[PDB]
Design a protein around this nucleic acid. Structure first.
Ligand code: GH3
Ligand code: GH3
Ligand code: MG
Ligand code: MG
Length: 862
DNA sequence: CTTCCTATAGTGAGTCGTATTA
DNA sequence: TAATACGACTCACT
């Protein structure tokens, strides 16, 4: 390991020496400096900005040590937070916070004082340790190198995109150790809060508020950034200038993996990376000794995927985002969102002010979301304008306990349209014909044209030619590209399809082409049992037409809608003539007879029968569809004036769900049956056992354990947290008692462990198929670039073909020699359950559909 | 039971009883 | 001595 081997005096030397060694030197320094950028503000970097962080940063810095006095002078006990806040350079303590705080804020969802603090406290610890190493490394990567100019130049402009090396030369000094927080979540809270606390005193940046008090279930405290700053983030460009996510790209090939920790970043002065983001220590420790070469090589290749900033897009990106009315509504405007003032009168509770409590909160619920999506945008935009030039930039990868592959950089190619459109590769090659074709294809996919045969897609392109004959020239005028489902990503194409015609099929192209199936997981299910209609629905079959699984269930459910629209039942009795009004909720259970008549009045298309579908891969039944169909289509409908027919909503919601669950239950029959099967295994395999009365017991609730195709092990270990609260006199005002979970539990939550065993095993696959994919595709068709998004594996226009094919070749080959369902069993037959065994088997019946029919499946790429 | 994972996480004022320090 | 900062416990919560 790193430590125990050499004294910290040099642990910060090896990384730099080795770095400067390959690649270059100029780029070597900027690297660890960059990595450092996620801990403390550059003394020089700062003096260079001569606008926003500039103001907040110092005010905070001061307050930090300034607070250390107030505490040092006082007698009595000292605020715990302090106890470990002192031995830490304040110039960092402040910086972390701002960012880390601004970071969390970018989450329109969880902004609860819990999260932030977690996020802050973590970093602080991430600096508490690696203290000197984080510093001494600087004094080191500061001094020049050992002579040499030529080879020290950095790359000699040699356009060859330097490739990383191997564990060989890799000095044992560059590894990883305990990448898990050593502090107790309890204390980690004291720190952040206190940080936050002092961030408030110093800078008013963000304020804390009591969200929906007295609400025993939805009661919590969150921090909402102050307007001032918010306002100077939509207008004042580069506002977050010096602000950079605690994780940024790299302008050099990343440090290859070979262990549970020790990858992505080089700088041994920071926090190590976890190959598998495990919600625990032990879980990750299991992954130590695995002997799973296929897993590593896979990620190693993905990580070594060089990226370039789409200089053209950016050019317009940061431009329009500052327009009062941007052609992209997906962009949080800069204008202020008013609201319907008090409804004429004042003291009334009919349906006006009664519903006003929910007719006015929309703005109080949206002003919070906008600021989110905006703070986010400004982030991706800074990094862009930041690396805009950088020759090449890599993204480090990680994977959840399930396998799925995530990029570590917050500015990952796995983000929104803006973000993706602003990315591209570099090792491109003269697209040629094969590519040009798919290029025009990718244009359509993005153009929202994914419901038709390729021939009709390409057609779509040639048809809208002149539509681009000016879009790529003066987009600032050609507001057409900003209409397609993904304008940004589309534009990127508009800029290629334009030049490809200015240079010919010789026109090199680095733009990655995206390939996404019809409905992942559901595709894999129909693959491990061969659901005849299943694959045919998830387009997995060599169909001649685009089978919209979502749309089939529409007409399908629509069919049953006409049924109950003729007979069904009838408006059941109210709830009047009774004893003493025991239950007056809904004085009419209505009937399926009039229900269909309401739906047929709304339309019911693929829309409604959408979410409820995919979600099925996560565990969505008729119970769940109620809420979905409601808030997704019913609830909002009426909250817009329409939906004037839905007299009793909740009921109608129970109606469609009903219809829905049916329509699919018989379609993707394999999926459900499979899940129910899985969902059945866990239970009697998760819940402990006892004995013939008395009380004695034997088998202890074993943690889910099985192995993926490529070899990636995995455990569910869905333990049950043991929470508690703290007492914190926040800002000498009140007492903030945080309810937090203790990262030292041991108990396990069966229930969940159950409802999750199935839906997880899914991704585990469609996330494992992927690895094998890229690997095979690497050695098979010598591929290097991969713009994969869990199920959207992409590559250069020329590597399209090999990819488009390779995916199948794996999906098949894999679910062929391998038997997920079966294998899983063998993974516990004896290891897990002992006696009984029975009243649980009932293997799922297989279907007749040779997987080779996939190698030719035109659609359903994934 | 009732929508996976990029992890999470009911709140604050009363009232006390302890180590801990200037 | 006498002043801190807080875990522990317990209610009522629009
Ligand atoms: N694992 C996972 N991936 C998701 C989920 N939602 C979307 N994705 C994938 O990540 C991609 C981008 O996700 P986000 O950046 O989180 O959402 P978004 O698509 O930008 O939505 P919006 O434009 O309205 O901001 C799109 C898709 O490939 C999700 O819940 N889980
Ligand atoms: N794990 C997970 N993945 C999601 C979730 N929502 C979306 N995704 C992933 O991101 C993908 C985005 O799909 P959409 O573009 O929203 O729909 P679609 O099914 O592709 O069909 P279409 O574009 O024609 O409407 C689908 C899926 O693989 C989610 O809640 N959880
Ligand atoms: Mg979203
Ligand atoms: Mg998809």
């Amino acid at each position: 390991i790193a430590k125990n081997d050499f004294s910290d005096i040099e642990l910060a030397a090896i990384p730099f020496n080795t770095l400067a060694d390959h690649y270059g030197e100029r780029l070597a320094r900027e690297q660890l400096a960059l990595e450092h950028e996620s801990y403390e503000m550059g003394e020089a970097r700062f003096r260079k900005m001569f606008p926003l962080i500039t103001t907040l940063l110092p005010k905070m810095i001061a307050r930090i040590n300034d607070w250390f006095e107030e505490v040092k002078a006082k007698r009595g006990k000292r605020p715990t937070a302090f106890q470990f806040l002192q031995e830490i350079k304040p110039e960092a303590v402040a910086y972390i916070t701002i960012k880390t705080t601004l970071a969390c804020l970018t989450s329109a969802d969880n902004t609860t004082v819990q999260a932030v603090a977690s996020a802050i406290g973590r970093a602080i610890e991430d600096e508490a340790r690696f203290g000197r190493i984080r510093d001494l490394e600087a004094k080191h990567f500061k001094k020049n190198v050992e002579e040499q100019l030529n080879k020290r130049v950095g790359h000699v402009y040699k356009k060859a995109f330097m490739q990383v090396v191997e564990a060989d030369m890799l000095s044992k000094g560059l590894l990883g150790g305990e990448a898990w927080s050593s502090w107790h979540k309890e204390d980690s809270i004291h720190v952040g809060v206190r940080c936050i606390e002092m961030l408030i005193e110093s800078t008013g940046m963000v304020s804390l508020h009591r969200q929906n008090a007295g609400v025993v279930g939805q009661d919590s405290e969150t921090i909402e950034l102050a307007p001032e700053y918010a306002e100077a983030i939509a207008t004042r460009a580069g506002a977050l200038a010096g602000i950079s996510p605690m994780f940024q790209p790299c302008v050099v090939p990343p440090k290859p993996w070979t262990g549970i920790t020790g990858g992505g970043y080089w700088a041994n002065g920071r926090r190590p990376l976890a190959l598998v983001r495990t919600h625990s220590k032990k879980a990750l420790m299991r992954y130590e000794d695995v002997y799973m070469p296929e897993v590593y090589k896979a990620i190693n290749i993905a990580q070594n995927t060089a990226w370039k900033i789409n200089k053209k897009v950016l050019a317009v990106a940061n431009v329009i985002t500052k327009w009062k009315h941007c052609p992209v509504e997906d962009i949080p405007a800069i204008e202020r969102e008013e609201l319907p003032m008090k409804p004429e009168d004042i003291d009334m509770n009919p349906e006006a002010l009664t519903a006003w409590k929910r007719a006015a909160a929309a703005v109080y619920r949206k002003d919070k979301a906008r600021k989110s999506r905006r703070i986010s945008l400004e982030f991706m935009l800074e990094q862009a304008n930041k690396f805009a030039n950088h020759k090449a930039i890599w993204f480090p990868y990680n994977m959840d306990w399930r396998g799925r592959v995530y990029a570590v950089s917050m500015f990952n190619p796995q983000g929104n349209d803006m973000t993706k459109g602003l990315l591209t590769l570099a090792k491109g090659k003269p697209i040629g014909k094969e590519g040009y074709y798919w290029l025009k294809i990718h244009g359509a996919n993005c153009a929202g044209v994914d419901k038709v045969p390729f021939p009709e897609r390409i057609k779509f392109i040639e048809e809208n030619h002149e539509n681009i004959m000016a879009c790529a020239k003066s987009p600032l005028e050609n507001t057409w590209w900003a209409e397609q489902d993904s304008p940004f990503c589309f534009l990127a194409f508009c800029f290629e399809y334009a030049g490809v015609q200015h240079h010919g099929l010789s026109y090199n192209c680095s733009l990655p082409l995206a390939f996404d199936g019809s409905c992942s997981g559901i595709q894999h299910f129909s693959a491990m049992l061969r659901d005849e209609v299943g694959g045919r629905a998830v387009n997995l079959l060599p169909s001649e037409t685009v089978q919209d699984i979502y749309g089939i269930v529409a007409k399908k459910v629509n069919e049953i809608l006409q049924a109950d629209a003729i007979n069904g039942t009838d408006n059941e009795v109210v709830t009047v003539t009774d004893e003493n009004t025991g239950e007056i909720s809904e004085k009419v259970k209505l009937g399926t007879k009039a229900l269909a008549g309401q739906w047929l009045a709304y339309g019911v298309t693929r829309s409604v029968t959408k979410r409820s579908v995919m979600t099925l891969a996560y565990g969505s039944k008729e119970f769940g569809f109620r809420q979905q169909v409601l808030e997704d289509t019913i609830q909002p409908a009426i909250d817009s004036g329409k939906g004037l027919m839905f007299t009793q909503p909740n009921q109608a919601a129970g109606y469609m769900a009903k219809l829905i669950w049916e329509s699919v239950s018989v379609t993707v029959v394999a999926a459900v049956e499979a899940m129910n099967w899985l969902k059945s295994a866990a239970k009697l395999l998760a819940a402990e056992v006892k004995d013939k009365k008395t009380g004695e017991i034997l088998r202890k609730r074993c943690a889910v354990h099985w192995v993926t195709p490529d070899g990636f092990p995995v455990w569910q270990e869905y333990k049950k947290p043991i929470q508690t609260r703290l007492n914190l006199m926040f800002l000498g005002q009140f007492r903030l008692q945080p309810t937090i979970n203790t990262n030292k539990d041991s108990e396990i939550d069966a229930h969940k462990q159950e409802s999750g065993i199935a839906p997880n095993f899914v991704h585990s696959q469609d996330g494992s198929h992927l690895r094998k994919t890229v690997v095979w595709a690497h050695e098979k068709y010598g591929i290097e670039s991969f713009a994969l998004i869990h199920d959207s594996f992409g590559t250069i226009p020329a590597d399209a073909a090999n990819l488009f094919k390779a995916v199948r070749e794996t999906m098949v080959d894999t679910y062929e020699s391998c038997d997920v369902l079966a294998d899983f069993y063998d993974q516990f037959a004896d290891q897990l359950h002992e006696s009984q065994l029975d009243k649980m088997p009932a293997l799922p019946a297989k279907g007749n559909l040779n997987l080779r029919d996939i190698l030719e499946s035109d659609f359903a790429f994934a």
